[PDB]
């Protein structure tokens, strides 16, 4: 059956021995300057000692809670531009013959109904690009007593409202069919954020060295530990 | 003849009919053949002594 013409011809990829194969080299690319910049921006957020008012946005409401919050917030989306025109045609027909609750959106409206205590829950995006827009807002929700959470995505918090991004999203009113589910969110979110807030205020961030540098420090410390522990016996 | 006149010439005007013909001389071709043979035969001999060094050890 087999053919003796078919030969197994191996290549010896040793030093100086045979030419190197086109293997994966993403780690050694000369990247453009914008890529190089946006990577070591994140590296600096890991290196530098990040203050706790910026560090608190790294704590994000987890996945199984985020699904329940976005499920409840899909019930109360603002009307789309087409649905605005449809309701205006409906009231036009009624003229020719109580408004439902929505989500409030933006830092300005959400802060003004945090001080007025009209908010029942405040969702905060974690990646708002000048962070100074929302740095105060967890502490203000703490003072006014409003439950605040932090989600991953200004992008996907900008998809409840029909836009690109959105900084914050509040709950002012909900319906009686969807009232106890908001309470079940408010309990977990309140005990995860508001009740645990002094620990948030003191929690400095970052200040982690490189894995190569951590490995070199670890090699020195484990060598000192071994060379001190082998002497006692 | 001048290098752009080499467009005008026929093929056999510009080489000799041998391996590396018209690019390399005959003496260096035959020593390059001998070298290419004897280096590889020495590599076979080193391979065999490697296998026998596996045999004694």
């Amino acid at each position: 059956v087999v053919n003796p013409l078919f030969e197994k011809r191996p290549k010896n990829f040793g030093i100086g021995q045979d030419i190197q194969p086109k293997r994966d080299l993403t780690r050694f690319v000369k990247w453009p300057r914008y890529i190089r910049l946006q990577r070591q921006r994140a590296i600096l957020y890991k290196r530098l000692k990040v203050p706790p008012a910026i560090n608190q946005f790294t704590q994000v409401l987890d996945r199984q809670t985020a699904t329940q919050l976005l499920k409840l917030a899909h019930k109360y989306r603002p009307e789309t531009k087409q649905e605005k025109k449809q309701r205006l045609l409906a009231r036009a027909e009624k003229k020719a013959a109580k408004r439902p609750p929505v989500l409030r959106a933006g830092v300005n409206t959400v802060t003004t109904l945090v001080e007025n205590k009209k908010a029942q829950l405040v969702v905060i995006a974690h990646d708002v690009d000048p962070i100074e827009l929302v740095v105060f807002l967890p502490a203000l929700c703490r003072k006014m007593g409003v439950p605040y959470c932090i989600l991953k995505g200004k992008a996907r918090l900008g998809r409840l409202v029909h836009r690109k991004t959105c900084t914050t999203v509040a709950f002012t009113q909900v319906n009686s069919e969807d009232k106890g589910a908001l309470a079940k969110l408010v309990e977990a979110i309140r005990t995860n954020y508001n009740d645990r807030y002094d620990e948030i205020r003191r929690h400095w961030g970052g200040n982690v060295l490189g894995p190569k540098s951590v490995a070199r420090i670890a090699k020195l410390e484990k060598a000192k530990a071994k060379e001190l522990a082998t002497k006692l016996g | 003849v001048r290098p752009k006149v080499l467009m005008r010439l026929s093929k056999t005007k510009k080489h000799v009919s041998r391996a590396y013909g018209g690019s390399m001389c005959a003496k260096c071709v035959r020593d390059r053949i001998k070298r290419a043979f004897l280096i590889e035969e020495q590599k076979i001999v080193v391979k065999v002594l490697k296998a026998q060094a596996q045999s004694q050890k």
Binding site: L37, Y45, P51, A53, I54, D129, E132, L133, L140 | -
Partner: protein
């Protein structure tokens, strides 16, 4: 509104939050070129005070001047 909070937060430039932000942004701006376009204001509040409206046709460039 949020803008009075951002205003008095940017008056506190000696604080830890704001020293952190000015240091990280100043690094990031030094990595770019001497004249380039910001796609949006860095300080939305200050831009609004100074005349800017967030509509089509208002443009913001971030440019550096060598110092002294």
């Amino acid at each position: 509104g949020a803008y009075k909070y951002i205003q008095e937060l940017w008056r506190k430039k000696q604080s830890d939050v704001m020293r952190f932000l000015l240091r990280v942004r100043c690094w990031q701006y030094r990595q770019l070129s001497a004249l380039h376009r910001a796609p949006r204001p860095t300080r939305p509040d200050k831009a609004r005070r100074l005349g800017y409206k967030a509509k089509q046709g208002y443009v913001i460039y971030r440019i550096r001047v060598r110092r002294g």
